[PDB]
């Protein structure tokens, strides 16, 4: 949806987010590029001063570009030294830039290092089938890394359209009661279940009624990943179509032919359903 | 009437325990708060002056800058720069134990300088603004058949804030049994104090039922107690992959009894909707004949 | 009997969804986990080889290293180093557009190299260990007149951990009405699950009252359900000024029914107490005639 | 209390904590020092190779020290270049060190920047006096900075010795119920109160009984300081002696002679007490 006020950019809000999200190769290409053009600009600036670089072919961009590069990176070989206030002032400027550039490039790199992905797999569907004697809404999550997640929290939120007394129709949110919503240590898989008891918002609902109310289900996951020593977040949304009534997730905890327990995420998205003649 | 809290949630009271600075509390905050243009200017500033100070220190040792014009500040200044930034061309080289001891020291300063400047730059990167807009006013009107205190927030960025929650706190003066007058905070029960995905607009509501601290209050009674309303919002901003928060405060005057916020969406010429934050602060009201 | 959870709380199950690496998931974790000696060795390693690769790249361009011995790796290698580290003495200077394009590139690599190495070093600094010791066993004995599941932790550092809390979770196999067998977690009610200042030792307790998942269980019954006990501890370590956590797990075999932990303090020759972590795992038991 | 197992140091546990806590001046002196001795060692190493530094007085420490300094800092003037595999290998080594050194020195500096003090003042005493009709245990906190603290939490914990049924005497903790324990925005002062109702652990206690049980009171404060954009922690402990029975804190919110409201922390530690003829 379009906004009408100040829809784009601001302070510390250039496409800086892009430098945080984009792929490493693209990130390195952007930096490398920004590195070359800046040395291209200083190279010109030196030429715009005439022949202020000793031992350099007059009016040559090359020798001027490489002089810049040797100044900014602070390599300072010594054959291409500066000449006269003009060059020595651009050098002072270019010295500061390379320092700021490094400072920045290091900031962005450490940042990108600290915004890791949750590495959490969400089942492609939800199911509503009996558990402990009651119809239950379920879905499951799997930890795709060997590192464990500490203090994992999950929320199952129902979003649908309802009518107020004043006659207004708005989107209402419902944090659904889970049998377990907190997991001290998340390591493998976790089946999140919502018992549909008399207190449930979807009690008495059917696939049809949920469609009418434009019902949707949000799953929000958060925890402290040991792999990154910092919190991670992940979420998924499910529409009515993605709910398998009568479905039962296929166990993923396999017992190996040789007395060992194993987890086979290959069956993670499998649902067992009964068929009628 | 002095408002205890400003609109941006800050305090409007004077401090008499006046104690200026401390350790790690110089302008360390002024470098993290100020704007980039100023931040950069200040840094460049400390950069030039620092090189200036050294340039002089070399002159105090007389002529210790080989291949440099005697007494020249220019030549000593550019020697400093070349040294501190570690460019080290080779023409201006030092001379004698004195010049070389400054070099060693100046080398450490530029080293520490880079480290500090890199810290500041990163830190400034880790204090993103929440980009959350508060409605200029609050309103009290019917929702689900009950008078409800309302106000709203809007996300000013395209990226969404998740695991967001809000706090609506009443602040007023009261009198204890011991006949003491004090200011007491009352966290207000919201119909919903969390938003899984905060992406457009959100109308926060406080039903004024029997359990409410303002149950039975009126514009007059709220005024006499000097009632104000504080709002804290927090969330995880995906844009920066880190948490953010926002605060706002309202006085009795900013409550429109009977008002209702107006739908914030318009229709572009083609026909598709669009959040018109221009109407975000608009409030509908019934006018009597 | 395969124990679902290892003692250090990790999983003892095999993964068949075998998918090795990804992005930002190379050995990025191996550099953060490994030991300093290895970390440094690996870095030094990548440092030498990288300079080695460039040294060769210059040789491919023939003789472009002025004042360097033709075909010499040694001279080209030390040119690389001098360039990448930006020392730039002045004797080995480049020659021709080819040599100068490598220099420009090598300058960027060392630049990025420093940034990365500085990141890793800082990161490794931000993953402190909790330095928390778990008792090798658990015990079930009377406290306040009730059988109580107990275990204890000890701080292995002089600095204290504050705002600490612990979690004792039972993990066992159960059968649903639909006749399904699954593993269910049961967070256990502790007499106290928080420690304001964790500095010495702490005995965590779970009274086994009517509300307990192990109310009425025995060593036999726990075994049949393959019951295990998971413990998570977290706190703010003042030593590093950041949060830390620790995990441990126990099997039925590690519960000493009737046992009691022994006071962990001794008496030095002078006469003052001292936490003897040597007795930390000791358990008193009554022996029958 | 002395520990008996492995009482001192370990990995990433050198007196590194000291480098994090110690004062800046001392920190800079330690770094500067570590900077000089390292260049003193390399200087020697070059001498232990003979005269491998061109244009340098033979066997001279000075010229060798400064050569090192010019190598490590990567200034590389060019008059003191290296000579023969020995020098060129120590240079490669010293190049790596300066890089690691900078990397480290920057780590420590940014760290020290991110472990700020809460800047919270605790009243020097506690009081037990009537509030809303009940005897109440109180104390107060003040924010010593203008920046505000978000999501401030405070706990008042009673620690005293009690006897179990098994006859064992141990230290029991009691998280005391506060009238308000959470403050969304902490800006000035905050009086933390514990109503001593029938449910209170100190109900019916006197100064004498609290002394016998070796009662103590812990106050723990935490919140997100805007000044540092990161959490802060502070705590204080109070003994029975520091409880003023019948005391009343002197209001600190002053009304300025000119219609303005002011906070005068000068009276923060003042308690009003009644006196008998
Ligand atoms: K350099
Ligand atoms: K140089
Ligand atoms: K040079
Ligand atoms: K030279």
SS in 3 state form for C51-118?
HHHHHHHHHHCCCCCCCCCCCCHHHHHHHHHHHHCCCCCCCCCCCHHHHHHHHHHHHHHHHHHHHHHH
Q: Rounded to whole angstroms, how far apart are CA atoms A93 and A115?
A: 33
Residue pair D31/D56 in contact (Cβ under 8 Å)? The answer is no
Q: Between A92, A99, A104, which is nearest B78 by CB? A: A92
Q: Rounded to whole angstroms, how far apart are CA atoms D108 and D30?
A: 12
Alpha-carbon dihedral angle through residues C121, C125, C127, C132, given to the nearest 10 degrees: 140
CB contact under 8 A, D92 and C86: no
* C-alpha dist (Å) from residue C60 to A66, C63, C160, C228, D171: 20, 8, 59, 63, 76
Token pair belonging to D58: 């033979």
Q: Which residue in C246, D216, D37, B31 sits closest to A224, CA to CA?
A: C246
Tokens 């399904």, residue located: C180
Tokens 């005293």, residue located: D160
Q: Rounded to whole angstroms, how far apart are CA atoms C242 and C235?
A: 9
Tokens 């307990």, residue located: C212
DSSP letters, D138-166, are: EEEEEE-SSS-EEEEEEEEEEEEEEE-TT
Q: Rounded to whole angstroms, how far apart are CA atoms A32 and A35?
A: 5
Q: At what angle do helices C73-84 and D84-113 cross, to 10 degrees?
A: 20
Token pair belonging to D101: 């050194």
Residue C147 Cα to ligand 4 middle (Å): 83
Nearest CA of chain B to the CA of C287: how many Å?
56
For residue A186, the surrounding DSSP H or E stretch is: strand A182-186
- Sorted by where each begins, the domain ranges of chain A are 6-116, 117-277
B65 Cβ contact partners less than 8 Å away, ≥ 6 residues apart: B58, B75, B76, B79, B92, B93, B94, B95, B99
A183 Cβ contact partners less than 8 Å away, ≥ 6 residues apart: A151, A152, A153, A154, A190, A223, C185
Q: Rounded to whole angstroms, how far apart are CA atoms B111 and B108?
A: 5
Instruction: Report the sign of the C-alpha dihedral through residues A261, A263, A267, A272, in that order.
Output: positive
* C-alpha dist (Å) from residue A163 to A171, A172, B144, C109: 9, 9, 9, 61
Per-chain residues with Cβ under 5 A from ion ligand 3 = A 78; B 90; C 90; D 78
Instruction: Return the number of other C-beta atoms located less than 10 Å from residue C181's C-beta.
Output: 10
CB contact under 8 A, B24 and D109: no
* C-alpha dist (Å) from residue A59 to A40, A63, C101: 14, 9, 19
Instruction: Report the sign of the C-alpha dihedral through residues B131, B137, B138, B140, in that order.
Output: negative
Chosen from B24, B85, B88 to mutate, greatest number of chain C CBs within 10 A? B88
Chosen from C88, C114, C119 to mutate, greatest number of chain B CBs within 10 A? C88
Coil, strand, or helix at residue A142? strand
- Using a CB-CB cut-off of 8 Å, the residues of chain C touching D221 are none
- Using a CB-CB cut-off of 8 Å, the residues of chain B touching D262 are 13-16
Residue pair B66/B95 in contact (Cβ under 8 Å)? The answer is yes
- Contact pairs from chain A to chain C, CB under 8 Å: 148
Nearest CA of chain A to the CA of D180: how many Å?
26
Within chain B, what is the greatest distance between any pair of CA atoms?
95
Instruction: Report the sign of the C-alpha dihedral through residues C19, C24, C25, C27, in that order.
Output: positive
Nearest CA of chain A to the CA of D100: how many Å?
14
- Contact pairs from chain B to chain D, CB under 8 Å: 148
Token pair belonging to D45: 């190493």
**Adjacent-strand bridge partners of B59:** none
For the domain spanning C21-128, the CATH number is 1.10.287.70
Nearest CA of chain B to the CA of C88: how many Å?
8
Chosen from B11, B27, B95, B97 to mutate, greatest number of chain D CBs within 10 A? B11
Residue pair D68/D81 in contact (Cβ under 8 Å)? The answer is no
Q: What value, to the nearest 5°, has the Cα angle with vertex B166 and ends B161 and B171?
A: 150
Resolution (A): 2.6
* C-alpha dist (Å) from residue B206 to A76, B143, B192, B215, C244: 67, 10, 9, 11, 38
Residue C85 Cα to ligand 2 middle (Å): 10
DSSP state of A53: B
Query: In the complex, which subunits touch C with 3 or more CB pairs below 8 angstroms?
Result: A, B, D
DSSP state of C21: -
Q: Rounded to whole angstroms, how far apart are CA atoms A124 and A271?
A: 10
Q: Rounded to whole angstroms, how far apart are CA atoms A187 and A183?
A: 10
Alpha helices in chain C (DSSP H): 30-33, 36-60, 73-84, 96-125, 219-225
* C-alpha dist (Å) from residue A265 to A125, A235, A253, B204, C19: 15, 19, 9, 41, 10
Q: Which residue in A89, A186, A90, A172 sits closest to A144, CA to CA?
A: A186
For residue C261, the surrounding DSSP H or E stretch is: strand C260-261
The experimental technique behind this entry is: X-ray
For the domain spanning B129-289, the CATH number is 2.60.40.1400
- Using a CB-CB cut-off of 8 Å, the residues of chain D touching A74 are 74
CA C261 distance to own-chain centroid: 27
Residue pair A137/A128 in contact (Cβ under 8 Å)? The answer is yes
What is the third-level CATH fold of D117-277? Immunoglobulin-like (2.60.40)
Residue pair C59/C51 in contact (Cβ under 8 Å)? The answer is no
Instruction: Report the sign of the C-alpha dihedral through residues D32, D33, D37, D40, in that order.
Output: positive
Q: Which residue in C6, C260, C165, B47 sits closest to A94, CA to CA?
A: B47
Alpha-carbon dihedral angle through residues C111, C117, C118, C122, given to the nearest 10 degrees: 160
Residue pair A68/A46 in contact (Cβ under 8 Å)? The answer is yes
Q: Which CATH number fits domain D6-116: 1.10.357.10, 1.10.287.70, 3.40.720.10, 1.10.760.10?
A: 1.10.287.70
Q: Output b/e per residue, A231-262; b: 16+ Cβ within 10 A.
A: bbbbbbebebebbbeebbbebbbbeeeeeeeb
- Using a CB-CB cut-off of 8 Å, the residues of chain B touching A106 are 118, 122
Nearest CA of chain D to the CA of B283: how many Å?
28
CB contact under 8 A, A187 and C10: yes
Instruction: Return the number of other C-beta atoms located less than 10 Å from residue D12's C-beta.
Output: 13
Q: Rounded to whole angstroms, how far apart are CA atoms D191 and D263?
A: 14
């Amino acid at each position: 949806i379009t906004r009408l006020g100040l829809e784009k950019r601001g302070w510390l809000d250039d496409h800086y987010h892009d430098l945080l999200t984009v792929s490493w190769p693209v990130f390195i290409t952007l930096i490398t590029g920004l590195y070359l053009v800046t040395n291209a600009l200083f190279a010109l600036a030196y030429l715009a001063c005439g022949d202020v670089i000793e031992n350099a072919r007059p009016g040559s961009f090359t020798d001027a570009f490489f002089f810049s590069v040797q100044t900014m990176a602070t390599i300072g070989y010594g054959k291409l030294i500066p000449i006269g206030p003009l060059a020595n002032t651009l050098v002072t400027l270019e010295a500061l830039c390379g320092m700021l550039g490094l400072a920045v490039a290091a900031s962005l790199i450490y940042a990108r290092f600290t915004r890791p992905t949750a590495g959490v797999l969400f089942s492609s569907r939800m199911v509503i089938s009996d558990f402990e004697g009651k119809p239950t809404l379920m879905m499951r999550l799997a930890n795709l890394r060997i590192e464990q997640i500490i203090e994992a929290d999950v929320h199952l939120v129902l979003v649908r359209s309802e009518i107020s007394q004043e006659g207004m129709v708005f989107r209402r949110f419902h944090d659904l009661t889970l049998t377990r919503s907190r997991s001290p240590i998340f390591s493998l898989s976790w089946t999140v279940m919502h018992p549909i008891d008399h207190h449930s918002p979807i009690y008495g609902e059917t696939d049809e009624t949920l469609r009418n109310s434009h019902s949707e289900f949000l799953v929000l996951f958060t925890g402290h990943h040991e792999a990154f020593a910092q919190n991670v977040h992940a979420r998924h949304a499910y529409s009515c179509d993605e709910i398998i009534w009568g479905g039962h997730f296929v166990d993923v905890f396999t017992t190996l032919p040789d007395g060992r327990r194993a987890l086979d995420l290959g069956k993670f998205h499998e649902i067992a359903q009964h068929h009628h003649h």
